[PDB]
User: What shape does this take?
Amino acid sequence: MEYHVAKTGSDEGKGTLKDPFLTINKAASVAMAGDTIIVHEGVYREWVKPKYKGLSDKRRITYKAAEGEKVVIKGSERIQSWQRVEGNVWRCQLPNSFFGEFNPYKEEVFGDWLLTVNEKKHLGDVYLNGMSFYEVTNYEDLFNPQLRTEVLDHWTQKIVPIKNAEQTKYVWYAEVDREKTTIYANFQGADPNEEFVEINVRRSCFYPVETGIDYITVKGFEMAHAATPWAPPTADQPGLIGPNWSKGWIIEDNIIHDAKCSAISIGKEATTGNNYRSIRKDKPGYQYQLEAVFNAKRNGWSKEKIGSHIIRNNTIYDCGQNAIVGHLGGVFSEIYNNHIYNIALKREFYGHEIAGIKLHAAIDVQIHHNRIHDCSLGLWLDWEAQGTRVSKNLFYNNNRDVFVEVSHGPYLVDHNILSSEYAIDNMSQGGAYINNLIAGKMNQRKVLNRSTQYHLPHSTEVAGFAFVYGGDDRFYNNIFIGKEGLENVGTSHYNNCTTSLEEYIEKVNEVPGDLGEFERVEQPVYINKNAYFNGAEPFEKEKDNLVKKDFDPKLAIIDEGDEVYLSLQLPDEFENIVGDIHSTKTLERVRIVDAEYESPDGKELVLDTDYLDAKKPENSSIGPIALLKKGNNYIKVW
Amino acid sequence: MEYHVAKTGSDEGKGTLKDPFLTINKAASVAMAGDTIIVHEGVYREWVKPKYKGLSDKRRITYKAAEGEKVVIKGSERIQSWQRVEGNVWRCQLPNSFFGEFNPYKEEVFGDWLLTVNEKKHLGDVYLNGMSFYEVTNYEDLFNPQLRTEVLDHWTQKIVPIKNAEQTKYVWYAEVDREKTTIYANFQGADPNEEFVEINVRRSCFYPVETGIDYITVKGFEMAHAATPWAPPTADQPGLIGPNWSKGWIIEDNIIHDAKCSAISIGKEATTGNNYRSIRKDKPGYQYQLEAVFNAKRNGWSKEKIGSHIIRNNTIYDCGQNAIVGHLGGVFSEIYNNHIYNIALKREFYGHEIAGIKLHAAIDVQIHHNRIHDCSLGLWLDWEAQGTRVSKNLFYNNNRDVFVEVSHGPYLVDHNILSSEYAIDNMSQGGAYINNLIAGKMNQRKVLNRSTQYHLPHSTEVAGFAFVYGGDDRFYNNIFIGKEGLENVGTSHYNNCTTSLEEYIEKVNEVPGDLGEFERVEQPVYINKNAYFNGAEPFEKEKDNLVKKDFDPKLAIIDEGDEVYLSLQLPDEFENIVGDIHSTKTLERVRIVDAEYESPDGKELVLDTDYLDAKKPENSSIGPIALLKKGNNYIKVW
Amino acid sequence: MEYHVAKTGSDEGKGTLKDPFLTINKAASVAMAGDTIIVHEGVYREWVKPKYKGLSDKRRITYKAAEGEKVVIKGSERIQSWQRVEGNVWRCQLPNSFFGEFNPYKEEVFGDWLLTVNEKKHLGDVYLNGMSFYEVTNYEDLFNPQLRTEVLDHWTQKIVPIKNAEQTKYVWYAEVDREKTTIYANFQGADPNEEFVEINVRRSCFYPVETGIDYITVKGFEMAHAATPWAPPTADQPGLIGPNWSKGWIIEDNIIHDAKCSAISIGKEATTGNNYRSIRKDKPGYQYQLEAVFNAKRNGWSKEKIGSHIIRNNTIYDC
Ligand SMILES: O[C@@H]1[C@@H](O)[C@@H](O)OC[C@H]1O
Ligand SMILES: O[C@@H]1[C@@H](O)[C@@H](O)OC[C@H]1O
Ligand SMILES: O[C@@H]1[C@@H](O)[C@@H](O)OC[C@H]1O
Ligand SMILES: O[C@@H]1[C@@H](O)[C@@H](O)OC[C@H]1O
Ligand SMILES: O[C@@H]1[C@@H](O)[C@@H](O)OC[C@H]1O
Ligand SMILES: O[C@@H]1[C@@H](O)[C@H](O)OC[C@H]1O
Ligand SMILES: O[C@@H]1[C@@H](O)[C@H](O)OC[C@H]1O
Ligand SMILES: O[C@@H]1[C@@H](O)[C@H](O)OC[C@H]1O
Ligand SMILES: O[C@@H]1[C@@H](O)[C@H](O)OC[C@H]1O
Ligand SMILES: O[C@@H]1[C@@H](O)[C@H](O)OC[C@H]1O
Ligand SMILES: O[C@@H]1[C@@H](O)[C@H](O)OC[C@H]1O
Ligand SMILES: O[C@@H]1[C@@H](O)[C@H](O)OC[C@H]1O
Ligand SMILES: O[C@@H]1[C@@H](O)[C@H](O)OC[C@H]1O
Ligand SMILES: O[C@@H]1[C@@H](O)[C@H](O)OC[C@H]1O
Ligand SMILES: O[C@@H]1[C@@H](O)[C@H](O)OC[C@H]1O
Ligand SMILES: O[C@@H]1[C@@H](O)[C@H](O)OC[C@H]1O
Ligand SMILES: O[C@@H]1[C@@H](O)[C@H](O)OC[C@H]1O
Ligand SMILES: O[C@@H]1[C@@H](O)[C@H](O)OC[C@H]1O
Ligand SMILES: O[C@@H]1[C@@H](O)[C@H](O)OC[C@H]1O
Ligand SMILES: O[C@@H]1[C@@H](O)[C@H](O)OC[C@H]1O
Assistant: This one.
């Protein structure tokens, strides 16, 4: 059945093209496997809750915007009952019943790893013609807010410009008592009843209220203004849109924005752990997180039941925690051709869960061909990045590009453009960095007081757990570019490491013993055919490299809106360093997990296509794009 | 069917009382669930291999010695083909076929955690009228061996007397080529063909060659001379007798001795891990051990299929590694009323697997009413001692009594007599030490570089894994006795610990954060109503205790052969301390595992009977025996 | 490491091309993940038992015949100790130790779903210049066997031609006592000591004795004459060659023949069920089979641990 939803409809109707339903949730309450729901032009202010599940990739339930029609799903409501208090501050008042059981003005940003605990923030928000406001703590702060033009990036401790300074003068404050919710805001001269002013009301826009609602496709919608909660790996992880612990969703061709915390969630649900560290306070989030993995294994977490979602061709921006988030629920998923930007720039709250994309246990997840910029952190893979492949992505204008934490691999980072000045946080082992352009520093550190799980290949089955001893990384065919005063760009971080698993084994076994003898020897690194320009430094034992500290590539990423270009100068010597095609055969297995770099189906992986998807021969230029050559280069990269 | 085996029988017979079989293995090849095999007087030189399984506790397959008859199963053969070489050295030669696939003179003591790697030892042995010999490395060492009267105990680094000094002059050496096995030995003047001289030949005496041969009872035999291999938790763990990865055995009323390494094994089998650290050399045994736990979970390791064995009323002695050993295969078992002595005293080889009883993952195992003495280490619980209860045991004349390593509890040590000068090695957390007599030091240490599993209660299901942060121990009603020059007796070890979980939580949560904030606060200890004599020292914050540094109890354990007595003097103030009866209600839950001290069935545990099995009154005196009193005490304890 | 095995070798050698081992099982006892075992021209009368496992599709242990060389692994032995009894019937006698723990002349074709219960058959066999014989039940049946040219196909109940009619006149019968095995056979006029006469001896040709020996490749061999047992789904299922409950084998480019029952087995092992219907007789094989599926699931039967084998480019016949 093909159901239709339109603003001329009725929920008492048949749901046909000629007698359509009025709300998307009515269609969601009757559609069954194989059905399609076509939504016609309009703004639908509701939280859509798919009731029945799709039964296979063939028998999905598809929700889509009608061809050529603009369909918006919003979690907000327009408010036209404001009254002027004094100056530019206005006030509205609503019955608590307006919000039901979830009131964004009462609910706080709260939970494990949230660090800004002194100034409480809430899940509400106020918008003036689409622009969100900044929450203030006290009524008095409403009247003469100060324009701010700079802000401290918490992780890098660097003062950076505020992207939208004017927005810093628009503030809101609310109070909720037993009966009413009262919201105040400074509109800086505008009349909020005349302008288009909205407030957050609902938690999500498209998200099942039961788990296991598999095989849903959601396509072609604009979705916005969701009061989503802080979403650490140790809690339920709702988002503006997400599968809620199920398998096989396809979220595509959507424009998603203004999720308070995370926009798309492919995370976990509450029964396997819900902020126990913050509520019970007896054990740290670290301890409760490794327990949640086993709780989930008992609650069906496996390829058969959870994951294998596809998130493609979406534009996601202006969210406070993440464009995409999730622990466990994203295993075996694919994330590609998305444009992600402006994530967590307002910095109203901070904690260790923020990034354009953050995934915990991203087992065999493929993240490729995405454009990620203007984020405090572009991508964060945290625990169990086993089989994960980050390939052919464009990262720029981020405070940091990529962070791979407490993982053991095998994980692959290939053919990417990592152009920010702080390119990689590496608190893992088992990585392979192949054919990337890396123009920023790498902070590489061991993690000896946290052990985290590893798995059987291509599975959620647990094989063991380990601490991060550091090293056991491969770097081949990368172009590194440093800059004045910037330290730690390149691969010199590994200078004390062994250079082969054979050397490591020989050194450890020189004197009889067990763990202590292994701990005294540094793990191997496999590094060759990299170039180092403008201050980047190589691993001292690399055999074949090109080092020209004096050469300045003058790299620039030029964003022209829908298109993006890369400008780069390369030295004549670039023609003389040639890269090999890497594959499962050429990449040494990781030591602790004892696994190969394979495709998700267990077959050989061959890295013979570049960032522009051009097939390359046996001997080609190093770096992400085969077309790069000595001299001037100007290449369209998006 | 009741099958009979007798030395007047025939394996071509019917196996009845009137027409009995000749070998025990013939009966083992035909007996089925519910049958009994009765073995008549004689020495049976064979390895019995139960073929079919018992099907329930009711439908067991029972192997027993005929009432009032002496039945011996031996892995050796008597050798009467010795020829004098020179002096007191004699030689015999056998075809390699005499040993089949397993030749003790070729097989080495080998594997993970074996520390004596310089001079290789083998699994063979030579006996003169029952007395085993010492292996020597070179042919030349056979001729004038030197009497040794003292030896270094490896762990304690103390020089101690050799129990049987004369035995040190009896030595053997062997060579195996592609055709023959040649064995040389110094008989110090005796004629080995006239005396009764035996050599090890077979690996085991009573042990299935297939796993899953459940519900077998083995009763009333003497078994001896088995060439058993080094048995670490990361390898197959064969023994002289054992269930070989199955459920429900009862091993009772047997006299077992002269197993090269371990005598009774309730350990694991090879498919879940087999000396990978020693063979592959890429990862430590630590890493391969935690992997073997998950390999076994996938290979049916659960209460439904493995464990629940009963080992009772046996006498086990003169073994080189352990009287009882086992990783995983012993879950939910009961070990009681056994007499274990002379374990690993020859010190021909050493490594981290030696103890009278060593069990890894002794989940809900009950070890009680055992007499363990003259061992280098009496009891070693290593990893996953969750629910384990060590109660009413008698430990004396051991270099060390009890070692609980890398465990998280809840584990209970109650009403025991630990009389050795080095009483406890505690490298765990989550313990409860209740009503013991502890006359030696405790070495307590954190373990921050190894994380090990913990489980759901009463189950093999994995709940998580943790490092040992130290503390989270309970000590109530114990009598501690120090000695001149002996440090670390008592509970002062915990002086920097918090005194309740409430205090720990309040201190950790003073400053916001996660794991680092928990790590900076010491775990709680629950200590009260203990006595400290002769130099023992208390936890400074203990509220109610009795400390008399100048009172000397003059403890003595008097072993008269079949009976043992405890001689102890107590001060007048002794009965001023009134101990409480401890139970699930009185014992605070362990922190990391978040579990209670319960009975194996999940119900309340009440510690209301003492070492002599007397019911304890609400208002009892402390220590292991309620009848202890001020003044002189002379009590039969065995 | 690339190990070599050749008839000019020694198991006391290093196992290199210049100093090769003599038996394939010697190489199988030392090869580790990533190694290759190259076997040179010859007939290897042994049961090869891979000891260590391969660790991935990349780090396999590969056993292969040397390029262009004919390598045969057989479970039989040639017998040249035949004595004529009478007419065309000859006899040989072998101490039971010649067979060890598995004697094909004692072992019966037995088990769940076997229907020919009246006349017992055994796992032994006799071959004359490669042609197997037909077992007969009694000593007297050896002397004047009758040529048969048609036979009843049991399922279809149709009488069909016997493909090799002449073979029906070649019969064997054996007796096993406490000390030795006596095998009789009618050679129809040929001298079995002069012709090439073989008898089954070993159960398998290439099969691990432990389960979990993953990622082995076996390529390019001729393998033949294995005394394999009846292999229903409710029993251990050994074959002439097989992975024995593991993952990732590649069995390719081999010529396999004359397995008594099954040649290549990718079946189950004994612990999940072993002819309980036939031995216990309380429940049918149907009931025990559905139970074996759950017993195997508890034992880790899953894509991660079992299966994903490749059997390709082989010629398998006369089983
Ligand atoms: O940190 C942000 C930076 O990455 C860029 O997007 O400009 C705006 C800043 O707030
Ligand atoms: O390279 C970084 C850039 O991408 C942006 O985020 O501003 C801060 C710089 O350090
Ligand atoms: O040896 C190769 C291995 O790398 C795997 O990927 O399968 C293909 C094989 O050819
Ligand atoms: O260490 C041993 C000690 O515990 C006692 O048994 O006497 C003999 C010593 O070897
Ligand atoms: O107390 C110990 C005793 O039990 C024996 O082992 O000899 C050494 C002493 O330290
Ligand atoms: O593989 C995907 C398939 O599962 C889906 O149905 O359509 C899109 C494809 O990319
Ligand atoms: O003046 C402050 C303003 O700068 C910020 O954006 O919102 C908080 C206000 O108090
Ligand atoms: O995940 C499931 C949860 O959604 C349901 O509410 O409770 C049962 C769980 O298995
Ligand atoms: O356990 C995760 C940890 O590795 C990271 O630092 O951020 C906090 C949690 O998301
Ligand atoms: O690089 C991309 C890879 O990462 C993805 O998994 O499959 C498509 C490729 O182009
Ligand atoms: O400034 C934004 C830009 O970064 C994005 O790429 O396109 C949308 C603009 O609002
Ligand atoms: O299970 C029974 C056990 O409880 C008892 O102690 O000994 C006999 C066994 O059959
Ligand atoms: O003391 C003996 C020594 O002389 C011999 O070499 O090795 C065996 C010991 O018992
Ligand atoms: O992993 C075990 C370890 O904890 C102990 O020290 O002995 C070695 C192993 O048996
Ligand atoms: O430890 C316990 C012991 O004290 C009691 O006497 O018998 C049951 C055991 O579990
Ligand atoms: O220690 C004693 C031992 O020496 C003796 O041989 O048998 C009894 C044991 O208690
Ligand atoms: O059942 C017991 C309950 O009554 C008590 O309150 O807590 C301890 C439990 O064992
Ligand atoms: O040899 C190849 C094997 O390794 C792969 O797994 O499947 C394809 C085969 O050709
Ligand atoms: O004569 C019979 C023959 O036809 C058959 O092949 O083997 C059995 C003999 O009895
Ligand atoms: O434990 C079992 C092992 O004994 C058998 O050999 O192979 C299957 C395993 O499940």
